[PDB]
Amino acid sequence: AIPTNFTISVTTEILPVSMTKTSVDCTMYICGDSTECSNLLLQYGSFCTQLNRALTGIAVEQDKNTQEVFAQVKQIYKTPPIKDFGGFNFSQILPDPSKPSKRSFIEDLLFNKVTFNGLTVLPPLLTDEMIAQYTSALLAGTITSGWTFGAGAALQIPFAMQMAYRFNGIGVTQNVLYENQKLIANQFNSAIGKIQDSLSSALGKLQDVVNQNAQALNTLVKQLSSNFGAISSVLNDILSRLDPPEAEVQIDRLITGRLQSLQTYVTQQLIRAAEIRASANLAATKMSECVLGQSKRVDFCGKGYHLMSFPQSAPHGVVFLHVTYVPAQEKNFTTAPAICHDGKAHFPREGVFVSNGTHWFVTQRNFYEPQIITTDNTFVSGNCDVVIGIVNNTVYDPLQPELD
Amino acid sequence: NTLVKQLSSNFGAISSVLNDILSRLDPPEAEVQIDRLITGRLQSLQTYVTQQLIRAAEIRASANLAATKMSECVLGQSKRVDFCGKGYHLMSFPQSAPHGVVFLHVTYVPAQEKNFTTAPAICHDGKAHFPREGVFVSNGTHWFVTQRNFYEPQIITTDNTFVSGNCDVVIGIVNNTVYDPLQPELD
Amino acid sequence: DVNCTEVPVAIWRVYSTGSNVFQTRAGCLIGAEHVNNSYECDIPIGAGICASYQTSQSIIAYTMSLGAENSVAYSNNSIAIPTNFTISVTTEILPVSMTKTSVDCTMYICGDSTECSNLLLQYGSFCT
Ligand SMILES: *[C@@H]1O[C@H](CO)[C@@H](O)[C@H](O)[C@H]1NC(C)=O
Ligand SMILES: *[C@@H]1O[C@H](CO)[C@@H](O)[C@H](O)[C@H]1NC(C)=O
Ligand SMILES: *[C@@H]1O[C@H](CO)[C@@H](O)[C@H](O)[C@H]1NC(C)=O
Ligand SMILES: *[C@@H]1O[C@H](CO)[C@@H](O)[C@H](O)[C@H]1NC(C)=O
Ligand SMILES: *[C@@H]1O[C@H](CO)[C@@H](O)[C@H](O)[C@H]1NC(C)=O
Ligand SMILES: *[C@@H]1O[C@H](CO)[C@@H](O)[C@H](O)[C@H]1NC(C)=O
Ligand SMILES: *[C@@H]1O[C@H](CO)[C@@H](O)[C@H](O)[C@H]1NC(C)=O
Ligand SMILES: *[C@@H]1O[C@H](CO)[C@@H](O)[C@H](O)[C@H]1NC(C)=O
Secondary structure (H helix, E strand, C coil): CEEEEEEEEEEEEEEECCCCCEECCHHHHHCCCCHHHHHHHCCCCCHHHHHHHHHHHHHHHHHHHHHHHHCCCCEEECCCCCCCCCCCCHHHCCCCCCCCCCCCHHHHHHHCCCCCCCCEECCCCCCHHHHHHHHHHHHHHHHHHCCHHHHCCCCCCCHHHHHHHHHHCCCCCCHHHHCCHHHHHHHHHHHHHHHHHHHHCCCHHHHHHHHHHHHHHHHHHHHHHCCCCCCCCCHHHHHHHCCHHHHHHHHHHHHHHHHHHHHHHHHHHHHHHHHHHHHHHHHHHHHHHHHCCCCCCCCCCCCCEEEEEEEEEECCEEEEEEEEEEEEEEECCECCCCEECCCEEEEECCCEEEECCCCEEEECCCCCCCECCECCCEEEEEECCCCCCCEECCCECCCCHHHC | CHHHHHHHCCCCCCCCCHHHHHHHCCHHHHCCCHHHHHHHHHHHHHHHHHHHHHHHHHHHHHHHHHHHHHHHHCCCCCCCCCCCCCCEEEEEEEEEECCEEEEEEEEEEECCEEEEECCCCEECCCEEEEECCCEEEECCCCEEEECCCCCCCECCECCCEEEEEECCCCCCCEECCCECCHHHHCC | CCCCCCHHHHCCCCCCCCCCEEECCCCEEECCEECCCCCCCCEEEECCEEEEEECCCEEEEEECCCCEEECCCCCCCEEEEECCEEEEEEEEEEECCCCCCCCCHHHHHHCCCCHHHHHHCCCHHHHC
16 A cells, blocks of 8 residues: 555654752751751751752752753854745744733743742743743744754755755655645644644643652652650640759650651762653654754654654743654555566566566555566566566666667 | 761750760650650661662663663664754763763764755756755756755756646746767667 | 841951942942953853952953854855865763762661660661
8 A cells, every 4th residue: 555645744843951949058958046956956967968968969950951951052053034835934932022022822822821948949040031032043943944953054945945955854755845835834823823732722841840849849848847755746836844854854855856857868869860861862852853954763753654743842841843744645556576687587677567467567665656667667687587576577778769 | 977967966955966865864764765866867878768769769760761772873873853962863881880870972974065956846848857865056057956964066967856736737847958978879 | 138228237357348349130249340341251250250269469340242253154156165174183982980989778777786676667668
């Protein structure tokens, strides 16, 4: 069976990249204003230093993630002003002048769908303005320059002409693009409409990170109130109702109990950070290959044959649009491994032999385009007798009229 | 270093060094004092192991990456953009380091450039001609076909191009004459 | 997380007040002067601000650039073809192992006491 039509499809993929940078002061969490709490804590020593050497390890990693997904480029490309892209209407995904932050429409439709006792929250190094600036460069690069701006200096090429190369990479001949340019553009511009619809309806991968990294802090602050088996949870009460020579044991218990909860929370941070790192690396490799190139890697860049991708920014994460080629509407055919001619066995150079029971033809593998069999489509390498399934026929010669 | 310093912490025991307690106090009082140091020391030891397990778990990912990069960059060329270094990839030479490995990647980079006019196809005897591999470029007067990555022009032969359909459908096309190299010799 | 109005109340000798002070979203930055130019990020501060040491030599803090800028010459009938090339060599660094540490928990906790062992067997398997 050989397919005879196709549909361009656009598919969506969503990835987390950073959790919120946070920090805790060991002493302001464990103690109130009590000095004796501090002086008893000084009996335990170094733990209140390691807990910051731990959390600061996470805080810098959360920069180096966002730094490394996005900064593949050092040259902010302007978009051309004239939107001549041969029928493609990217106005959904480009930035626009009027918005109070220069996020695209597809980004603003997205941004909406996502929602003290020493606890401190540190801003990120990059702002959402800087992030959205970078992605506007990756769009401008890929639309005007193909892959070349990834490999080196950016070489301009017409968009409707680069699509021919992207088709050539999947074994479809360029005539199949140029004879159909109008129809293909309509399929594309239609599919972007479904993304606006579907996005308007789904961010669970992103949304639940914001949930868990709040919920753990709520657990940590609630855990202040526990008695831990002390006589009460307020240090002033301990220090007033009982003399220090014995209130010492109550304080020592309540410090030990509280400390255990911080010593757990810091590990429940680290083990998550170690998963977000694996996600940032996967997103980095997806961007390096599927956006700045074209990749043969089956189903790595979304379902189907891959053509191109566009990145779009999101809070704490990134979203891709993968544009893919899907074959459809196929017909059955008779086939044979080889043709027998004047006693000698012909094989096709690239395509495959088919017959509609009535005539014999050769056609490329992935899009029905039958042709006359010639000694220029084929090469010869033996007698007919040796290969199974050979079929007798005749090979036309364009050099035969050239007898004159 | 942190783990050795933790031996000096007293955890509310009478003294840091056990031999001080275990000399100056009798068993039934020592046995309620030494009990604290053990709990303090264990918890410092427990924390250390939980740190080593995570750093091991992350180095394992780096070693597993390097083995992927060696197989796909040294024992062969690979076309994964930016995997074997920036640019187009040619070969790589490994070198060793203390606790590590260091690659040298060898990469080709296109440099000087010039602007040209170009057209999707040639319209000939009412028949369109497409290039087999290169792209058509004009220097503003003559029309050539050239490979994509390095300017090296050639005449529009009957044998670089192939034909498919009439001139009517292709949006951008320029009328131009294709050359048949057999035409003289065939006489 | 301190408004610059409040900072003097805790105080280091010069920088109590009376000095260059620069409010930022990251906080109150003092002892460095703001500049309208932009550069690459020498040292990070936060929220798009980076700091550097510069020549009169002083510390300056500035909105970091994202690098340079240029347009791309795009037409619907024009193309650019490279006419020359250069080979290049680059080094990538990967860690592969760390030290094989090993620890004897009985020696560490108890030294050479026997009694400290006789206590430790209250706790069971941990030293295994
Ligand atoms: C292929 O699909 C397109 C879009 O639905 C349609 O316009 C065209 O007529 C189809 N052609 C065939 C071979 O059915
Ligand atoms: C195809 O299979 C049938 C049934 O096994 C057999 O009779 C026939 O000879 C085969 N033909 C080819 C092309 O080998
Ligand atoms: C092709 O013709 C030859 C000679 O007549 C014959 O031996 C052979 O069986 C034929 N093969 C087929 C596939 O008809
Ligand atoms: C184009 O190249 C040909 C090479 O033979 C040369 O004769 C011609 O003058 C060139 N034209 C322009 C405008 O550069
Ligand atoms: C090519 O020639 C035909 C017939 O004269 C004409 O209609 C067409 O516009 C010409 N195209 C160009 C690009 O000169
Ligand atoms: C600092 O305090 C002044 C006076 O109340 C106020 O006007 C200003 O907005 C405050 N700035 C910040 C960063 O809160
Ligand atoms: C480019 O677009 C303009 C406006 O549609 C058109 O006049 C011109 O012929 C086009 N050029 C080519 C060769 O595509
Ligand atoms: C290409 O670059 C090399 C090395 O710099 C130089 O020797 C040579 O002249 C250049 N050739 C061209 C065509 O620019």
